Design a protein around this ligand. Sequence first.
Ligand SMILES: O=C(O)c1cc(C(=O)O)c2c(n1)C(=O)C(=O)c1cc(C(=O)O)[nH]c1-2
Ligand SMILES: O[C@@H]1[C@@H](O)[C@@H](O)CO[C@H]1O
Ligand SMILES: O[C@@H]1[C@@H](O)[C@@H](O)CO[C@H]1O
Ligand SMILES: [Ca+2]
Ligand SMILES: [Ca+2]
Length: 334
Amino acid sequence: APPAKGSVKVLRTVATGLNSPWGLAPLPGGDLLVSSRDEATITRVDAKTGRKTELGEVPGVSPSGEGGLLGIALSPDYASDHMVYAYFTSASDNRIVRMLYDEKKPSGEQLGAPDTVFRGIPKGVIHNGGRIAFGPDKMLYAGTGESGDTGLSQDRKSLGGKILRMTPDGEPAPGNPFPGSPVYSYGHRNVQGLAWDDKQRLFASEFGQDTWDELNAIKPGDNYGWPEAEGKGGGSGFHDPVAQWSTDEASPSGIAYAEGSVWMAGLRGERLWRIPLKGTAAAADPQAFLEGEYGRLRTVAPAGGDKLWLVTSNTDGRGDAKGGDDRILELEVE
Ligand SMILES: O=C(O)c1cc(C(=O)O)c2c(n1)C(=O)C(=O)c1cc(C(=O)O)[nH]c1-2
Ligand SMILES: O[C@@H]1[C@@H](O)[C@@H](O)CO[C@H]1O
Ligand SMILES: O[C@@H]1[C@@H](O)[C@@H](O)CO[C@H]1O
Ligand SMILES: [Ca+2]
Ligand SMILES: [Ca+2]
């Protein structure tokens, strides 16, 4: 369905001056919530003006290296329950909490005390994963990393190097591949992107080491090969990527599905990748857009129809931040 050749138009800059923006949760009314990894804040961005409101600081966050306040996601029933979920690196682990958001409260006081729904994910200075999202099945999904310990990914008993699927209350999701376990898929290095297509099939981005970054089509119980395999050609028993990229051209974090393609934000690549899909295969060659125009790109989210939100990441410790960084852009895509 999507054309082989795509396009990306930057309609406008929506907001500026964000610090280490990471998680992005589009609100029903058109506004955005954005987390800061290193400041541990969640901030509301007014879509029209770019005006920023600090909701508050998430308690218990311990930023260091790639860890800190990471993915955020609205409850599937957010419109009525006003619950915001957050994945973050604590003193001891990575974990997921939920907080009651009340926009009628003073700035800084808008987040209720966190309810911890899931704990115990391995942490390190690197490879903490951190992207969370609710699937069309109303279950909570989380990408993790192996924390720099390559031995965790293949170990079904370790929460490191996995995609997890749980109830919103933090219990293993009914119908998961392994009895009593929140593990959905394994053999992952570091996963910071999740998105579903129109047929409710999950895709995930992944950072490779020095050779191949990945876009994977995720099936429950499948083994994506890390650390014995990296990129395509993993061998029998391993599930290969839909597409792979050199680490200098990608190093991908967030992904979004829109207009029949996966859109993938590249950090080191400083570019937005388009992967048009036919079923769970690439329909045509992936194409990159915006290379070096806005620096590092971390997060991309659907804004409805042919529109995307895109978040830069030049303030995350590995960029050269320019005046006004980091920013959110509005894109119109094909
Ligand atoms: O191979 C690379 O050049 C490269 C670059 C980056 C980056 O641009 O920050 C990451 C990685 N690799 C990587 O493997 C990884 O897990 C990772 C996590 C992050 C992040 O900032 O959260 N960046 C990177
Ligand atoms: O190193 C390059 C950088 O200069 C920019 O072009 C983005 O892509 C990276 O591979
Ligand atoms: O039928 C598939 C549809 O599900 C979508 O993936 C686009 O490609 C078509 O061939
Ligand atoms: Ca890498
Ligand atoms: Ca793999």
